[PDB]
Amino acid sequence: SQRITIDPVTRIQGHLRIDCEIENGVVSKAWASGTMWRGMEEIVKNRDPRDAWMIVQRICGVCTTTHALSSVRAAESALNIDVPVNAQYIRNIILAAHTTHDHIVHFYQLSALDWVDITSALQADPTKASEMLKGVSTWHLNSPEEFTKVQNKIKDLVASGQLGIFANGYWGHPAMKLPPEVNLIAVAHYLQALECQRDANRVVALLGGKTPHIQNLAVGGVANPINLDGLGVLNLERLMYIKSFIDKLSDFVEQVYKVDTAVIAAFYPEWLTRGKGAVNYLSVPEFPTDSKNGSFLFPGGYIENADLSSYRPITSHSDEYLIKGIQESAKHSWYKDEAPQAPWEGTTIPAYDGWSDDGKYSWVKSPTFYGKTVEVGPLANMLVKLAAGRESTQNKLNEIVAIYQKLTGNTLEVAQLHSTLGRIIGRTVHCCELQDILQNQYSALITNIGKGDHTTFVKPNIPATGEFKGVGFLEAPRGMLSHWMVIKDGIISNYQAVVPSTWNSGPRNFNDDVGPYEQSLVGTPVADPNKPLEVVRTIHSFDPCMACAVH
Amino acid sequence: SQRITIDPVTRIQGHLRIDCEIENGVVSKAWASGTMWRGMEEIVKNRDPRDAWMIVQRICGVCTTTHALSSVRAAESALNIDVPVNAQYIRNIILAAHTTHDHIVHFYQLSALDWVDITSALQADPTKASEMLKGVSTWHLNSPEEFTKVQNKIKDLVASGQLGIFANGYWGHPAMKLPPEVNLIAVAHYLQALECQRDANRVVALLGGKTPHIQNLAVGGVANPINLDGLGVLNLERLMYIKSFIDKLSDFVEQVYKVDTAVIAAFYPEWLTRGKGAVNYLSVPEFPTDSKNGSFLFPGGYIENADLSSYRPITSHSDEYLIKGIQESAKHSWYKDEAPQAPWEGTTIPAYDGWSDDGKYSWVKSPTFYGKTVEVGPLANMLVKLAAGRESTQNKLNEIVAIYQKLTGNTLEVAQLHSTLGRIIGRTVHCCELQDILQNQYSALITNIGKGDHTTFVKPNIPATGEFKGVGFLEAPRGMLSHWMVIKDGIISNYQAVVPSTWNSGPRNFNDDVGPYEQSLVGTPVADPNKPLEVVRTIHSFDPCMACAVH
Amino acid sequence: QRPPVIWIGAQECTGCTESLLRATHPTVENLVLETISLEYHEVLSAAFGHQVEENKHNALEKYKGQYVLVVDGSIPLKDNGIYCMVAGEPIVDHIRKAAEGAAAIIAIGSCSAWGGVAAAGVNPTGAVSLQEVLPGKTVINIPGCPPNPHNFLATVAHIITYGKPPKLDDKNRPTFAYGRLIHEHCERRPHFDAGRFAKEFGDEGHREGWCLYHLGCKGPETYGNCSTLQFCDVGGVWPVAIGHPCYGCNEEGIGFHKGIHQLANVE
């Protein structure tokens, strides 16, 4: 029996501490703690509703774009603004391209070193490594020559004695199961991923004005001036340049990331039977395509007790059933007001008192949906899409399963998706489907401009009296995001963000029910309590973002 | 005999007609004709000497940069200006990067379709193609998957029925000797070349202000403002960006272009025994690195009657022996004055009278060196470097020979370089050695700036009376270039360009001696006189540029 | 099927073709395999001589009324066309023949747009513009020496995607690229306004990125997108940003006529 602390958890966004009680070599109880707070909700209070998005975008630079977009949607909701369809296309391309960068970096830069041993890659035969991928991928950069060059880079780094960020990693740990050749393939793909994510962000930059932190939004639409015949504005040459980057993303996503996902599952199938965080799942529809903030390309919904057959669809960002269910508690968080609060009535009054196992132990609030704990994020969004019968999602999942089948002789059932690996799989499926979102929305924009619609912005008015409440939903890379704005006498009187990592990382709630991170860890085997790699494996599967969780 | 005409010769720069008399399937006599003239020498006359470079750069856009640099060197020569060393470094980087792009495009886009049969590539086995390169190249983009993708691009183009640039090519011609697999490899490399040459021109652009047609020169140095601490000027960030592109060039050059050059020689060894154009060769030293327009990184010289052991070194651009030897005749060209002229006394008086086999038949003049015909360009420059005992050149040639020997079991002797393939080999050697020029001169620039030298420009004075004469030499991608400027009463009173393709393509001279193109074709076998591929193979080896030749 | 293009060079230096090799959207490989069918281009054609002339004749027939005709270089009229002869005929004849069946006709570069360098000074060959040789036709002019290749490529794309040319100015230049004076969208305008001028290359002002007017910048009299679109898609690259004045290469009567250091007229 013993108590361990993992502080800092690395290869996430932000500041996270995980504590675990281990008994008989398995985690019996866990605590998740966000250890940094800024008070972004308070910083934005009493300002003009039109200004909020530039401030609250800075909740997070990993999921840049997302808080900007949720904030304008919230102001638009309060004000009853319908966003021009061209502004929706541009917003959608930005979110889809951003999320492509975000997921790729998560799988490779953030998560791969939980599963991949770089020392073992030094023992690989590059030719055997390449041979392993014959008939498995059509990617053009899996040659033995590529892999030898990558192996020499690792060799040279080790030879220098300055391992830096690769130093004191979990090399030779018994939970590292990949053959040397597969470790080498993974490092080669890690490096290749950096080129693909750079291209995804070039799409973002061309519409956003830069990234991180886009600068093209407005309450009422976007700041991009559409004029095919205009110098210095969003013309056909600029649109062609955007398309040139959109086109560079698919091959890596489909032929490397999608395949690596299937391969990690094939070598680590025990991780299909652990890391279940919840039995309830929520996602919101995303990528609106009509003139009234709807007609979403991706569906949303609520799953209760893992029952896909009786799920509740969510087709509108104005759905009162979704809106009315959401509350947050601070019983086990470092804030003063503890009872569950609807976010329009939310407070964020700091009340730090140090760590207590049975009291307050986190700056993350505890969200519930009609009093239940819920997992959000790519596992939720995949399960909802499967519940909806979305053919694209079924088909993409099936491709991953077919690779897993070929490698193992076993198949993958939906029950096995409620797991650390299922979570990873949902993220990969999301990234793959996002490439069709990009092609669809680029084509929709070109076509609409061709009909003579260059409209991008409707100037808002904000009554100087009255109190108005708005909510902006967004399906972010890490799950359902919502910004809740109250306007009174023309200024923001309350602002509350309920962020996907808040849902997943939040501590024990008002009824002392355990959040998804804490739940997922129960049952985790820990071979070496001083080097608890297995705990970090499951925690990384949720893609924690603690600047997001806490704000 | 039979008389044929090839008009237009394609996959060159500019407008060329080649005529051949063929006796029993063997070329017995040939005529080269430049069929377009602009009069660029007359256009630039009567202007300020400072303006010439911007005008005469437009002699050619393939060998962009070269006439700009020769022109400022010619004005600097007339004025006795010593160029600041930082301006030399910058000029040198531009020329070396430009020439890298130029040579790669020549081998692949201009020349490969003389030797490569794309319809045969459709029959290739991509896996067998890849296996042929095991141990022959370390290039990372020779996988079966890369080759299959390329094959499918060809297949899709053929299936469209719109062959475009590939229509009516010499597919199945009896002189096409490559196996299907090697044809497929070559097409893959043709496409990959386009990426490498784009990176080379990114180097050029960052110093030139754009390419084609750089805009950073001056009589007296360069227009780049060196200030590591300055906003909007050539600072450390900009220099780092230039370096990032320099670093991208070497792998393709060394692992693709160099290898493909050896391989083409291995499959076409008969082409080591034909296409000799001359017995005399000239090159000028290039890449000055001191404060007095000298200390060249590449040596120059004159070889007479193919005797490397008795060659005459040329180490200065003010060499009187070089200067005094150069003349041009118009006996068989469409100009009025026919006797050999030294270029400071040159005229360019048009006198078109149509084609005559024994009279005038070209807009190209006929240059001689002390009365002899001379070949210029990468064969000359390689042979001179070998004569000089330059280890870098001998070593690079030996690398090509080693690949050739691995494939054929045979070595190559210097005698075999006086040929169509030797010319191609010289060009490849040049491109390879230029990568070290780039590294050397970038490092030189960084180091010099670090010593506190930010100087780039010496403002000229131009006497308002008097007559004075200058000559600017440059070793261009196609060979020795010279611009000859006379200044009288402050303006250009004569301007004559003697360009490398003028040496090689010029017609019969004042003594009816045959120039390199025409001489090289004697003995060429022509299997099908309607489709004289063999003639075009030899002519393309010289990398004709007719805007250059004629101006 | 891809839209057909016929490209004829007259008194060209090939810089305008070469511009395509710097392009990124599309790259030249994607242009020729995906965007268009390049039915005739002598720089890249596998075929030569009688085979390539047969390609041209076949394409002019097969695609009559459908192809875009592109011409680089000036057209020399002196002495009955003989200063540019291809396959034994004046290039003006080849161009007029190809123009008869064209859906759209583009003069790429200053030489074809207005005569350019080849028509400067004494004009040895009587070089003229494409519009001058095709008086009955609307020639779309894409000037510059050479233009940014996307000034051409986005013009073609507009024809392909939307079925008509882009909006043009009164010189038949696309407004997205040529609609404004360089000086009316130049980042060094604040320095011009303040009298902060480089006086010689390498001087203190020059080394601070000051305005280049007193070095002869022709930005005040040249229409173009050089300060905004710039060149080569790397960021920050155009003549003025590198430290050299605009020469006016886009603009008839400016480039190749005025000296580099001659001062521009300011509106």
Place this chain on the structure above:
Amino acid sequence: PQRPPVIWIGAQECTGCTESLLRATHPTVENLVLETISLEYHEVLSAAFGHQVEENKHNALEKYKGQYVLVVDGSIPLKDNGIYCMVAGEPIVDHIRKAAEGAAAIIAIGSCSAWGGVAAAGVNPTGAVSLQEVLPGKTVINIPGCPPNPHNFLATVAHIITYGKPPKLDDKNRPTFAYGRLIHEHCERRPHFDAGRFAKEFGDEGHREGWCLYHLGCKGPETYGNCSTLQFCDVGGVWPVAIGHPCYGCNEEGIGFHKGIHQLANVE
């Protein structure tokens, strides 16, 4: 051959300043970490976590004493004894002061570490302050922006490595190559400002012609930076004004996160 060591500590950061590196091209992040520097501590990318990574940091601080570059992103919260950012059970202010003692150079990357930024704005709930405020005896090089173009940082580090000293700095310790001039004193829309050609609302006729954004609230007249010249992402033509949105003044203390988007700048 040994690479210069770097220790990167995030305080109240959003990670946007690290993420800027993932857009960089000269060097790319992979070349940065494999060729240019030895990144001895960076929690976003480190294989090691928890006890193992704190061990990396302590070992590195000792091994490279007097040699490493310390980089901090985010503001440093001083309210209530530092508890608004706790790493391994200790206030980040203490980790930062400990690492500062042995640093050869210290860089505040981003407006948050340079001057407090967004995290210190409004009522400043956590008593967030700048890196220079927590290190009064040390010269802190400030690389502001939210986030800066990554090369504003990477070329500063390169100057230190290649020539052995920082680049030239202004009176706020900002490198002059990146922050030496007002955006409005090198903005390509200046001709439109001069002529009174202003966009009045997004999507209007002037805006669709690329006119000046002053009347939309552009803070270029009061913001030092290189956004109009170096721009972003190395694709050409990409900065907020070129895209159609006014500068918000994110580089500049008292402008970004203080003034409304549409509030007009003072012109000098």
